[PDB]
Amino acid sequence: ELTQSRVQKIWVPVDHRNSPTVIVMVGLPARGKTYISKKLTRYLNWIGVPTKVFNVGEYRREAVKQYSSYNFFRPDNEEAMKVRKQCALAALRDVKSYLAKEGGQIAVFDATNTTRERRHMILHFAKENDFKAFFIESVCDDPTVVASNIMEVKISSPDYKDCNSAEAMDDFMKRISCYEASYQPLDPDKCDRDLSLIKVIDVGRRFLVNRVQDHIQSRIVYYLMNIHVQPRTIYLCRHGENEHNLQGRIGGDSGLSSRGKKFASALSKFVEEQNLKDLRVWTSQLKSTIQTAEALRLPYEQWKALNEIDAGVCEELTYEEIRDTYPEEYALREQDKYYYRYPTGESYQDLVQRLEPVIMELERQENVLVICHQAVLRCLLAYFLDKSAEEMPYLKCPLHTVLKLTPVAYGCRVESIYLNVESVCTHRERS
Amino acid sequence: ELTQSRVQKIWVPVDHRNSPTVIVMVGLPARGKTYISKKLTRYLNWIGVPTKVFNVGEYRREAVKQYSSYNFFRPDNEEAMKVRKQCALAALRDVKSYLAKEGGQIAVFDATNTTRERRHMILHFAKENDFKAFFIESVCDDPTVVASNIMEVKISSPDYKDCNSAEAMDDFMKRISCYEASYQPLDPDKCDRDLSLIKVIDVGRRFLVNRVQDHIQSRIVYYLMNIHVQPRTIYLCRHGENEHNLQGRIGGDSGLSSRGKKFASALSKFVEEQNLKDLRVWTSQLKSTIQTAEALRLPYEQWKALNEIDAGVCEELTYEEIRDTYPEEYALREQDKYYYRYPTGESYQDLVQRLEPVIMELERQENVLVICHQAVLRCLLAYFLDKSAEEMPYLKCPLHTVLKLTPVAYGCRVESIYLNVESVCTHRERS
Numbered sequence: 001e002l003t004q005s006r007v008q009k010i011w012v013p014v015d016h017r018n019s020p021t022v023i024v025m026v027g028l029p030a031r032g033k034t035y036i037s038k039k040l041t042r043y044l045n046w047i048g049v050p051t052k053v054f055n056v057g058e059y060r061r062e063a064v065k066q067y068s069s070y071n072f073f074r075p076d077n078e079e080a081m082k083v084r085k086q087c088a089l090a091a092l093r094d095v096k097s098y099l100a101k102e103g104g105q106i107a108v109f110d111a112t113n114t115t116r117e118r119r120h121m122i123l124h125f126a127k128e129n130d131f132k133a134f135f136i137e138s139v140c141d142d143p144t145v146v147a148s149n150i151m152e153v154k155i156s157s158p159d160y161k162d163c164n165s166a167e168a169m170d171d172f173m174k175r176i177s178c179y180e181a182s183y184q185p186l187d188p189d190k191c192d193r194d195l196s197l198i199k200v201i202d203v204g205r206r207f208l209v210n211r212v213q214d215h216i217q218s219r220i221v222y223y224l225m226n227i228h229v230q231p232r233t234i235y236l237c238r239h240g241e242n243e244h245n246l247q248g249r250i251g252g253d254s255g256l257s258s259r260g261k262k263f264a265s266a267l268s269k270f271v272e273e274q275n276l277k278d279l280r281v282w283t284s285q286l287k288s289t290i291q292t293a294e295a296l297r298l299p300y301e302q303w304k305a306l307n308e309i310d311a312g313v314c315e316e317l318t319y320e321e322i323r324d325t326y327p328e329e330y331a332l333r334e335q336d337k338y339y340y341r342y343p344t345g346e347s348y349q350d351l352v353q354r355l356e357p358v359i360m361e362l363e364r365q366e367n368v369l370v371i372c373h374q375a376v377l378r379c380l381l382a383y384f385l386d387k388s389a390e391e392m393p394y395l396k397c398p399l400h401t402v403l404k405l406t407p408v409a410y411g412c413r414v415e416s417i418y419l420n421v422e423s424v425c426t427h428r429e430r431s
Numbered sequence: 432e433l434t435q436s437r438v439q440k441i442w443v444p445v446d447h448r449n450s451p452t453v454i455v456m457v458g459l460p461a462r463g464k465t466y467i468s469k470k471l472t473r474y475l476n477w478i479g480v481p482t483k484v485f486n487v488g489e490y491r492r493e494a495v496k497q498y499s500s501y502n503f504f505r506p507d508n509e510e511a512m513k514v515r516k517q518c519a520l521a522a523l524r525d526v527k528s529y530l531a532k533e534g535g536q537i538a539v540f541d542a543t544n545t546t547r548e549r550r551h552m553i554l555h556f557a558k559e560n561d562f563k564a565f566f567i568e569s570v571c572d573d574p575t576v577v578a579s580n581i582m583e584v585k586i587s588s589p590d591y592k593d594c595n596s597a598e599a600m601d602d603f604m605k606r607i608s609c610y611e612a613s614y615q616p617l618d619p620d621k622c623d624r625d626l627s628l629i630k631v632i633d634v635g636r637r638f639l640v641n642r643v644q645d646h647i648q649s650r651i652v653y654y655l656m657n658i659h660v661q662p663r664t665i666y667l668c669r670h671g672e673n674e675h676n677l678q679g680r681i682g683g684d685s686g687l688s689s690r691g692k693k694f695a696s697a698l699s700k701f702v703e704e705q706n707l708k709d710l711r712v713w714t715s716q717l718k719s720t721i722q723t724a725e726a727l728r729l730p731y732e733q734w735k736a737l738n739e740i741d742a743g744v745c746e747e748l749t750y751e752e753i754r755d756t757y758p759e760e761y762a763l764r765e766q767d768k769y770y771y772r773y774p775t776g777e778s779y780q781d782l783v784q785r786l787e788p789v790i791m792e793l794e795r796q797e798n799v800l801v802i803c804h805q806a807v808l809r810c811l812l813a814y815f816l817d818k819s820a821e822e823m824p825y826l827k828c829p830l831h832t833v834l835k836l837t838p839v840a841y842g843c844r845v846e847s848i849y850l851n852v853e854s855v856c857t858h859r860e861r862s
């Protein structure tokens with residue numbers, strides 16, 4: 001005796017009457033601890049695992065109004081040490097409220113945590129709140145890398161609002177020397193034999209993994225081994241306009257219109273003028289995306305995971321038709337566009353689970369052109385631009401427009417490029 | 432201008448007119464090199480990557496008729512060394528024919544390869560045939576583990592056909608001591624800095640990964656970190672009989688019949704008499720599997736990936752109806768049941784890609800009960816019992832029967848258990 005939920009179409013038994021994890025970042029400054037923290041979090045939240053970053057740096061920038069210099073981080077700075085410890089403890093406080101009282105699942109503790117003492121303290125914290133502890137250490141003693149990092153995300157930090165490169169660059173170098181003496185890296189073969197951890201070496205050149213307590217830690221591990229930092233570009237766009245677009249019909253597998261092909265031709269000119277040494281092209285298995293890719297005269301690959309969302313019994317229909325034929329359904333979708341699943345079809349949530357492999361592969365690749373569909377494109381875009389599940393189903397991803405995503409600082413930079421070719425508009429807001 | 436293939440329903444441009452990899456196993460005997468090789472291969476072939484194992488041991492057992500003793504593996508055994516080298520070279524010969532002439536993609540070289548010399552030779556081989564080289568080393572100096580391994584897959588080997596445990600166990604111990612002196616493990620921080628490799632330590636307790644050249648090596652890495660060897664059991668069965676089963680209609684989302692529920696009740700008694708400390712239950716999101724799981728009064732989890740194959744425009748239909756309504760389609764499926772994809776639906780190939788995450792999770796778990804559907808069940812079973820894509824769509828997976836899969840030696844042992852409850856028969860051979 002079960003009843004099927006109206007929105008998610010899930011069968012639940014009629015009533016009629018996974019321990020949370022604390023990810024601990026470890027490493028000297030300018031080692032990508034925050035970079036990793038944010039990206040990790042962006043991913044986890046995307047695939048549905050509620051994650052939040054707790055940057056002890058911000059707690060510090062909060063308590064000590066405006067920034068001083070490296071003197072603040074001197075081991076002999078008795079007062080700063082007091083404040084820094086109170087920052088770490090305040091953050092763990094907020095962590096407890098997240099994992100135990102706010103429904104959070106993973107809490108990333110973003111700090112240097114370069115001493116066994118500090119780590120043992122966190123372990124204790126976890127041990128008493130019934131939380132698992134997974135460590136991620138970033139080791140890299142390459143002056144070129146450290147130097148480059150200092151330039152990319154430090155010299156512009158709010159701490160150096162009143163500094164130039166020459167001085168900021170020096171203050172941070174001294175800042176790093178502060179942690180160096182007492183820095184005790186993880187020792188998975190001795191003192192840290194029992195800790196579950198992954199040590200990222202030379203920006204992913206080598207990894208040392210210890211244990212792994214569950215699938216969640218398993219994924220995280222997989223992810224870090226696939227992301228990289230080499231500069232590259234990811235272009236995203238939909239198929240050229242198609243017959244169904246003109247008729248305003250959803251789903252289906254129609255072919256490009258006269259304009260759609262025109263757009264496909266423009267896309268070719270665009271890719272051409274991008275001057276990319278290499279470029280991979282991915283499409284869905286639906287006709288319209290393939291016809292578009294063909295116009296590029298470049299080898300491409302088809303992914304069934306990139307097919308537009310499945311509209312179920314509403315495929316081939318027009319919104320008007322749905323509104324009339326399946327009124328109640330048309331309403332259930334407008335009130336919960338993300339979780340709503342079409343009868344015998346999918347939901348935006350289903351797309352995310354279906355696209356996970358695509359995202360993981362995009363992180364591994366260099367330059368990639370993905371020609372897909374509206375809903376599918378929103379999903380991917382929501383990942384790169386960190387858009388909540390609430391706004392995902394409404395992001396604007398118009399026809400004939402190329403979204404150029406480039407890596408910058410801690411996230412992704414986006415550039416819209418309309419290839420100057422008319423087409424209908426398939427976008428529709430909440431109502 | 433494209434045309435859609437009739438079987439796979441894929442759009443291809445009308446005509447009208449990934450370097451192969453050699454996986455190198457490394458390690459002393461009784462370290463699971465062959466275990467890993469077979470499992471790795473079983474998996475890769477399942478997800479579509481043509482892989483083959485080249486056990487240098489078999490080449491040896493082939494050339495030297497019947498087995499001697501550990502004297503054969505003595506470093507001072509000038510003649511044996513000659514034969515052993517000719518075996519390794521003959522196997523690489525067959526590797527070349529596989530990766531370059533037989534359409535193979537991955538070739539697992541199963542040997543001790545415990546010396547830098549031997550390894551350099553293989554590198555050279557790869558370097559000249561344009562093959563990538565990925566190494567997997569298994570290090571474990573635990574006497575209990577080594578001892579146990581010697582018992583589980585050595586003492587019964589065809590080499591010891593005329594030996595008892597007491598003597599076989601001793602001959603293998605001496606055999607191991609032979610390789611020990613010249614054994615040079617991988618050194619990812621010195622001599623082997625440039626080699627792409629994964630070093631499995633203490634049966635997966637710790638890993639040291641170096642590089643990783645592509646996604647294929649990325650997956651392999653992920654897999655090894657998720658499989659384990661602790662004893663556990665995996666039960667597989669379909670939902671209890673349902674309305675559609677009675678009407679002989681495919682797809683749909685109907686509920687259990689009177690018998691189906693009866694079966695669900697029997698399943699409860701079965702699980703109960705299994706005396707399992709723990710047991711996870713997974714179902715699909717279709718009503719029939721959930722109703723069945725409910726009868727167990729155990730917490731279960733729903734997976735959309737476990738939903739029966741999507742019959743497309745044929746859902747809810749009876750084979751008779753399909754045969755009549757979509758004759759041409761009914762024929763295209765009987766001639767190629769694995770690759771055939773239903774209009775707007777899936778193929779067995781699609782199921783495999785859809786089930787990959789399930790398989791990966793089953794490898795991570797201990798005891799798991801999976802209540803699914805016919806086609807879905809075949810897919811999973813094909814993985815555990817290593818059944819080709821040709822036989823997969825025809826494996827017999829009857830209603831009300833529990834397949835009990837247990838780990839043994841290098842593969843999985845299967846036991847069928849009919850819970851003694853009538854039901855229709857949904858199996859149908861090729862015709």
Ligand SMILES: Nc1ncnc2c1ncn2[C@@H]1O[C@H](COP(=O)(O)OP(=O)(O)CP(=O)(O)O)[C@@H](O)[C@H]1O
Nearest residue numbers: 029030031032033034035138140149152153203229
């Ligand atoms: N595994 C890694 N090793 C080294 N650098 C990395 C890295 N992952 C990312 N980066 C680089 O690090 C920079 C971001 O550094 P981030 O600010 O996250 O360091 P940090 O958190 O270690 C310093 P701090 O404790 O001083 O705030 C970017 O330039 C990024 O490309």
Ligand SMILES: Nc1ncnc2c1ncn2[C@@H]1O[C@H](COP(=O)(O)OP(=O)(O)CP(=O)(O)O)[C@@H](O)[C@H]1O
Nearest residue numbers: 460461462463464465466569571580583584634660
């Ligand atoms: N990573 C690992 N470390 C140690 N033992 C493992 C292992 N993976 C599997 N095993 C165990 O090893 C046994 C299979 O060993 P296998 O025969 O594959 O070893 P081997 O190939 O190293 C020996 P040889 O070169 O003498 O043939 C099984 O008992 C299995 O459970």
Ligand SMILES: O=P(O)(O)OC[C@H]1O[C@](O)(CO)[C@@H](O)[C@@H]1O
Nearest residue numbers: 029056057060084111112113114
């Ligand atoms: O985590 P710890 O050991 O308290 O060091 C924290 C400090 O590190 C920094 O990231 C500087 O490297 C600061 O923003 C932060 O206050």
Ligand SMILES: O=P(O)(O)OC[C@H]1O[C@](O)(CO)[C@@H](O)[C@@H]1O
Nearest residue numbers: 249250251308311373374375426
């Ligand atoms: O995401 P939305 O607003 O529900 O629109 C989804 C529809 O958009 C389309 O791509 C048409 O523009 C259809 O294929 C799909 O069903």
Ligand SMILES: O=P(O)(O)OC[C@H]1O[C@](O)(CO)[C@@H](O)[C@@H]1O
Nearest residue numbers: 460487488491515542543544545
């Ligand atoms: O790979 P190597 O160095 O030639 O050693 C191969 C030998 O190892 C064995 O697996 C025994 O440990 C034999 O079956 C095989 O002939």
Ligand SMILES: O=P(O)(O)OC[C@H]1O[C@](O)(CO)[C@@H](O)[C@@H]1O
Nearest residue numbers: 680681682739742804805806857
């Ligand atoms: O694998 P086959 O032989 O095509 O049968 C598949 C059908 O079996 C069923 O499970 C019915 O027994 C249907 O849901 C499914 O479409």
Ligand SMILES: [Mg+2]
Nearest residue numbers: 033034057110
């Ligand atoms: Mg930081």
Ligand SMILES: [Mg+2]
Nearest residue numbers: 464465488541
């Ligand atoms: Mg072997």
